RNA sequence: GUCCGCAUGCCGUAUCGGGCCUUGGGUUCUAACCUGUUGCGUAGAUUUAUGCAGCGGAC
RNA sequence: AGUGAUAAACCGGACAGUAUCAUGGACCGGUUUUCCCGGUAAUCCGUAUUUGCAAGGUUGGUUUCACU
DNA sequence: TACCACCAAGTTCTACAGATGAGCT
DNA sequence: AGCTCATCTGTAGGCCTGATGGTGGTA
DNA sequence: GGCCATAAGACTTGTATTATCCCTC
DNA sequence: GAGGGATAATACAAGATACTGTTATGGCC
């Protein structure tokens, strides 16, 4: 079993093979379909058939090669780059370069033996991509709303025209998201379950489903709450900002306008917890209950809370 | 002569009068047209005819009251908010940081006797509004451009639709700016003079007019370069203390923002600019250091050319 | 007819800037020497300047000779805390820092702010303060060597031991010199005795307090003297003499631990859930105020008041 | 067969964590005393732990006795730079309960990394380092009193003048004790003479260099010794877009880095080989302090080089 | 009701540090070349939030 | 101490943003320093968006209940 | 009258200065 | 033997840890 | 069945801008 | 003569003040 580190750039890949005997092989390739084919050929040239490959999440530039190698039948791991940075310090490395990084990742692979990565399902990719786009538009819409607050009259026609366009485009995406989940029987069913939770509506169900996926890739609900960056350490914030930010207003609605939410808010209020601290707790609770309800396969039952 | 400080917020004004005899008169008002009329009456009530008011430049919320008082005939100074903060720290060693009161502003006014403020011409206000709008849409356009690189396929129709919209809008504002400056014969002439400078074109000339204005409100070109935050900040004391010089950046960000690309065009594609680049390069200056020097130079020549009243003459450089 | 004069100060040179009533400036550079200071007084009288208010930053001890020269010549002198000058420059919108700029800045500071006049301290106060801060220096070095004995190698031990003996003898010598100083003055002797009547304050703290409180009633309120030490909150400000603040912590511990009035104070704050060091912080402020209070009263400490 | 043991040390107590081949742990606390150390070894031999690799953090003199005990008991001991410990913990997860490093973490560090084995220094190497370190302390104190002379009040000056004399005599005394140490050992006498043959290295810098290099050559390459001093440039590069400036890493002993600054200033100013090096670098647009940095690295590297060569400084090689 | 008095309550995390650890990257390949800004020392200045409470005195 | 179970309890301060303000050090001719008067589109002192904008990654600590 | 231990525990600013080794007087 | 003089914006990381002064208590 | 008010108060890689010149149709 | 592409720069830190929106639900007509 070989261990292979790949350092990724926009244009090139730097590869470092760590042989069982402990010697290294190194080569650069273009970060292209042609380059990826050269890489697989080169590995099978040196009779490397069984290998565990470690690569860092580097924008989207690592994705095609990771899929390529997975299909070629290698174990691929895509690591959070924070882990790689800490690892480099733990090895007492005194430089940061492409070849240094590729070698660091081969050692990471051997010592840590990280979990294997799976390529997401085409629909999972699509839904995530629509949810991320929708959030980008929403942010732009908010920028333009803030501007109306202090805008001069000559500026105001421009801002208004833009707000109309952005409102129409947001509505179009929402329908494109709905069509996606309605067409897949699994997603249609899983979305209907998420919405049964009081405090979770159309917008938040699509976000939750985008990050949970089609399958139950988490063993326990609390792992998904950790995934979102919501568990205390202060909150870790070791997780997707986009998932975490999407739960804040659902938390307020829950703690304010639902039976199970108010019950939770009061119990923590009694123990002398401040406004946001409760919302923090409710965010973590919504994440956990959302995953729980999907495992159960059954509508939200308030009796459990 | 009285000394009045006004502490401004969205909804409420807080006023503090400082009498010649050294006593204070304080009152709060609404930040509305009604509130501003109450204020003038309340001053005129206490026979305060001559005064020097000092207001922080907090944003658009303090502009209506400043214009109200300027019209009522008082002397109004609108001060950079960072001066107020620094003034407080000069008044004691343990003063409440992050607090500048109306009382503190009345003192500021008395001690410093700041320069008077003049409400801008309606045409200057218009042009500045359009230019600032133009810059905002450019930034959104660059946001969406950056996204096309790494976008997923489902996302691309959306990003493409938005880019076409933003281009059409940018083209429209450009025309609106052009129609503004062409319908005023002074601005039409002044803009033509700016664009005669090699490295200054349609977009930079508008930004420059927006901040120079119709009148010549700077006595010297070196003051306009200071205004943009482009001058080097020297730091020396005695024999021991010798800080390195750097662009001060104490000045208007929108001006400074607009001059970097012109500077890069001037030092690259132009005689008088390459002349300047080569000299400083010989004397050991790095590439982006030279750019910062060209930024200050363009500012200063822009003001020089307008004051001269004739097109850019290369012989002077 | 009052002129306003700024002086920027360096080790070797002085930059002087004179702001006239009519509003025009006169400037000149001088050597920072006895001869230079004489040239300065001549240059002013040359320009027919008798009434001036002079403003100079506290710049180590380099500003002190010229401050004394000008005060003796009969001018008004203000020695300003330079943190105020830096804020002033920023309030004045200045974009460069040079010696000629700073001298001009200080002349305006003078005109606008009209700071309180500076009085040169009494020779006895100057000496006492000098001995106290020396004593503190050597105590710092003694603690360093003493900390080293813990982890020291055996070849290092003879050296560290020999130094500890030297520093102990020197500290004793200085303490005696301080005692001889305060004894030879009737007022200081009396005031020293009053301060030591406070439970928690002994030979060492009393000399530090005398060295900053003055010979006379210098402060108008107790909390002013507590602010002077950097003890009033704004978190504790720490904007004040570190040598005075340093001196009050161990008194504060012994008082809150082993005195009636101090334990009383400790318990009151402990009732309201205050941490160990937070109580000590509070006790430091209190001691500073009571030290000032007792001296003003002119009579020994009375616990009944607290 | 091989066990992996972490030891979390404090002044008073040890906290031990054995990690067995099967993957289960043993834990027991001991007193940090001669008794405790003897008790620890017996407890290990009780559980028939004869082959092990112990891993301890380098926290000072409080952990040295136990490390020596175990080394003599026949185990493999590693004394790790504690910064490695903290970084390893962060590499093990994204949301760890605490940032602290404990005995269990050290056992896992040891298993995954199999760090290099620690060796107790020679008694003379230990003595020489101790004397050199003491000398540096006395210099700093002397420098403090020199600075005070400048702005002292008159009533203070007797005190400062008397201290300055005491410290000057003590520094002179300690220099002789260092000279006697190196002269008495034929190996150290020789090595020290070699170092002083280098232009720009004299009596003070030679003793500091010996103190860290020691009696034997424990670096495979001279460049590793410059790294040890923290004198090597730190490259920061990634892809097309990420390019930092190379700056002295400073990841090594301050004492060496401190010691070499003036030798570098002397070498580049007065010696031939140093001026040669200054000139070429200065021909490129290298600033004055940048060249000093470079010369500090070179001096470190040639110091190690010359000792490895075993023959005086040959100028023909430069 | 106002003005004064205060060794008053509310508010408060001192000072100086000390010791030990550190086995680059690239190259024309290890005392060569490209890549390099050490260490962190000294002195001086610092006058209330009387802000709000108490308690006391005078008018 | 491992192993499972967990939509329960304890620990929990999300994100994104918006608008606005800024009158050098000095140099060159007079005076014979500066100031002041006159001049500054020149020379020396400059690392833009007070370092802008985009994308990607993130599988709790414990408490209970079992089982050994 | 002299000696002991134990209480508490993880800001600004304005100016200055040494070091070491090789060559020169 | 003693003196001179060579560089100027600022920016590694970690883990162990303690005295001080004054008082009441003790010898 | 449609509309409105209300609840809280750091890692790994990338990138454009404008104005002038130069080129093709 | 009009329209479009390529291009110049690279370690980062170093002023302030005033402010706003997100979603999902239980209320309303
Ligand atoms: Mg990488
Ligand atoms: Mg000064």
Author numbering:
A (entry chain C): 5 to 237, 250 to 321
B (entry chain D): 5 to 321
C (entry chain A): 4 to 237, 250 to 321
D (entry chain B): 4 to 321
Text from the published report:
We recently discovered that IS110 family elements encode a recombinase and a non-coding bridge RNA (bRNA) that confers modular specificity for target DNA and donor DNA through two programmable loops. Functionally, the IS621 recombinase associates with the bRNA and catalyses recombination between dDNA and tDNA at a central CT core dinucleotide present in both DNA molecules. The IS621 recombinase consists of a RuvC domain (residues 1–122), a two-stranded α-helical coiled-coil domain (residues 123–188) and a Tnp domain (residues 189–326). The IS110 synaptic complex comprises two recombinase dimers, one of which houses the target-binding loop of the bRNA and binds to target DNA, whereas the other coordinates the bRNA donor-binding loop and donor DNA.
To facilitate bRNA-mediated DNA targeting, we introduced mismatches into the top strand of the dDNA (6 nt) and tDNA (6 nt) at positions 2–7, and found that these mismatches facilitated synaptic complex formation and in vitro DNA recombination. Using these mismatch-containing dDNA and tDNA molecules, we determined the cryo-EM structure of the IS621–bRNA–dDNA–tDNA synaptic complex at 2.5 Å resolution. The synaptic complex consists of four IS621 recombinase protomers (IS621.1–4) and the TBL and DBL modules of the bRNA, as well as tDNA and dDNA. IS621.1 and IS621.2 form a dimer that interacts with the TBL and tDNA, while IS621.3 and IS621.4 form a dimer that interacts with the DBL and dDNA. Consistent with the observed recombination adjacent to the CT core sequences, both the tDNA (between tT9 and tA10) and the dDNA (between dT9 and dT10) are cleaved adjacent to the CT core sequences (tC8–tT9 and dC8–dT9), with the conserved serine residues (S241) in IS621.4 and IS621.2 forming covalent 5′-phosphoserine linkages with tDNA tA10 and dDNA dT10, respectively. We conclude that this structure represents the post-top strand cleavage state of the IS621 synaptic complex before the dDNA and tDNA strands are exchanged. The S241 loops in IS621.2 and IS621.4 are ordered and interact with the D102 loops in IS621.3 and IS621.1, respectively, forming composite active sites that span between the two distinct dimers in the synaptic complex. However, the present structure is trapped in the pre-strand exchange state, probably because strand exchange is prevented due to the base pairs between the TBL/DBL and the mismatched nucleotides that we introduced for cryo-EM analysis (A81:tT7, U82:tT6 and G166:dA7).
